[PDB]
Design a binder for this molecule. Structure first.
Ligand SMILES: CC1=C[C@@H]2[C@H]([C@@H](O)C[C@@]3(C)[C@H]2C[C@@H](C)[C@]3(O)C(=O)CO)[C@@]2(C)Cc3cnn(-c4ccccc4)c3C=C12
Lengths: 11, 253
């Protein structure tokens, strides 16, 4: 998926 | 000589996210509703800036990515209120809320129809920082502790490592006290007072969160929240209720 937060925690 | 030998505190000082500007259309309004929408928008950016900051904290990312999420979703309002409080404190001799260098809520706007009840809590942390004359270093540590101030009732998936980090920063805050001037009896009282302040943040967070949740779910009001922030809120409202949230307190007082 994406989950804005989760995605930033891996950006 | 030193400076070239990094200290936990000197590192906290450099990862501190830089000041954001509001964008604007600076003729800044009187409608309580526009203020909120505007602040919610800036808030979204402010939170992303904070997440990045969390990832730069020594030991933070060495936690299960799941705990890194739980933490940020439990403490964002806290990190937000504390940083806004500090910026408001260092900004002026008193009375205001400094959200950005190009976005300030003064005495006038602060008292528009539905503003004061929301802002008074934000002014609180600002007055507290002033009252106790908190140093920049004390604040850098306290703010880190705030990120680690709420764990799930049923622990984390890195409990051990968490406990070790939380303590590292508690001791780190102790040092910042020893440094600010140099007493011995006051060091105790001083540590008692700051841990007290940290403990009271859960309370202001609780007040600010009610308005945040009430406002987000209304749809009779229709107040805009940015995409990511909206997600975190929809995600936390169910848990914040059930008592699945545990607040670490320095004083059972
Ligand atoms: C604390 C703090 C509380 C939030 C505020 C806005 O979202 C509007 C909220 C949710 C308010 C609590 C709630 C009552 C609220 O008034 C509403 O319910 C409106 O619907 C926000 C995120 C926005 C913002 C833009 N800047 N920045 C900021 C700047 C420098 C350091 C820290 C933060 C801040 C700090 C914020």
């Amino acid at each position: 998926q994406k989950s804005l937060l989760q995605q930033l925690l891996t950006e | 000589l030193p400076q070239l030998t990094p200290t936990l505190v000197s590192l906290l000082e450099v990862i501190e996210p830089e000041v954001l500007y509001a964008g604007y259309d600076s003729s800044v309004p009187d409608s309580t509703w526009r203020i909120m929408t505007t602040l919610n928008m800036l808030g979204g950016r402010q939170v992303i800036a904070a997440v990045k900051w969390a990832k730069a904290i020594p030991g933070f990312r060495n936690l299960h990515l799941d705990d890194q999420m739980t933490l940020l979703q439990y403490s964002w309002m806290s990190l937000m209120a504390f940083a806004l409080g500090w910026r408001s404190y260092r900004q002026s001799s008193a009375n205001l809320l400094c959200f950005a260098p190009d976005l300030i809520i003064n005495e006038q706007r602060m008292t528009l129809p539905c503003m004061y009840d929301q802002c008074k809590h934000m002014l609180y942390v600002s007055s507290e920082l002033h009252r106790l004359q908190v140093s920049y270093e004390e604040y850098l540590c306290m703010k880190t502790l705030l990120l680690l101030s709420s764990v799930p009732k049923d622990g984390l998936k890195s409990q051990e490592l968490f406990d070790e980090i939380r303590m590292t920063y508690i001791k780190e805050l102790g040092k910042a006290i020893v440094k600010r001037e140099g007493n011995s009896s006051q060091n105790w009282q001083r540590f008692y007072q700051l841990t007290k302040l940290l403990d009271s943040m859960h309370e202001v967070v609780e007040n600010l969160l009610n308005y945040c949740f009430q406002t987000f779910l209304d749809k009779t009001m229709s107040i805009e929240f940015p995409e990511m922030l909206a997600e975190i809120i929809t995600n936390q409202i169910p848990k914040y209720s059930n008592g699945n949230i545990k607040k670490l307190l320095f004083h059972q007082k």
